[model samples]
Target: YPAKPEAPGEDASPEELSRYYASLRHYLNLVTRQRY
Candidate 1:
């Protein structure tokens, strides 16, 4: 299932906390450039 580390929340269950999204996870480096 290639699960990603999902965080637990107030309205989240044990199963819900362990999952990942189809969308890729990433963020800008420092200069606001799309860093891979």
Candidate 2:
């Protein structure tokens, strides 16, 4: 399966971190749906 990138680190800007987390939640939702 394809994978999402790692979480943003301390060096990341606030915008970058927010986008990363949004994408992470989207990825998680996809995975959860697949199990059903």
Candidate 3:
């Protein structure tokens, strides 16, 4: 079955989402650098 659409309250602003993704990328890079 198809999932229901999220409410507007569950959505993020483009800038917020971008920042979140950037943080994730940074964290992944750190882990890669540490070889852990």
Candidate 4:
């Protein structure tokens, strides 16, 4: 399997930190907002 990036630590910004729910939320929001 492909490897993954290191998980952000407690100091990470909301944008730097990876959360299943938050990533999904951001991805969906970006897709919905994209011109493509």
Candidate number with greatest lDDT: 2
RMSD after CA superposition, every candidate = 7.9, 6.4, 10.9, 7.4
Candidate 2 lDDT over residue span 1-36, tens digit each = 334645454436633666566557645565565741
The parts of candidate 3 lying over 4 Å away from their true place are: 1-15
Q: Higher-TM-score candidate among 3 and 4?
A: 3
Taking all chains together, the TM-score of candidate 4 against the true structure is 0.24
Ranked candidates, highest lDDT first: 2, 4, 3, 1
Arrange candidates by TM-score, descending: 2, 3, 4, 1
lDDT, candidate 2, at 17: 64
lDDT of 4 by residue, 1-36 (tens): 222323333435634556433454434454455522
Query: How does candidate 2 score on lDDT?
Result: 0.54
lDDT of 4 at 3: 22
lDDT of 1: 0.32
The candidate scoring highest on TM-score is 2
Instruction: For candidate 3, give the lDDT of residue 19.
Output: 36
TM-score of 2: 0.27
TM-score of 1: 0.16
Error of 4 at 19 (Å): 5.6
Candidate 3, clashing residue pairs?
A: none
Encode model 1's per-residue lDDT on 1-36: one tens digit a residue.
232434333334533333322221322222235422
Runs of candidate 2 with Cα error greater than 4 angstroms are: 1-15
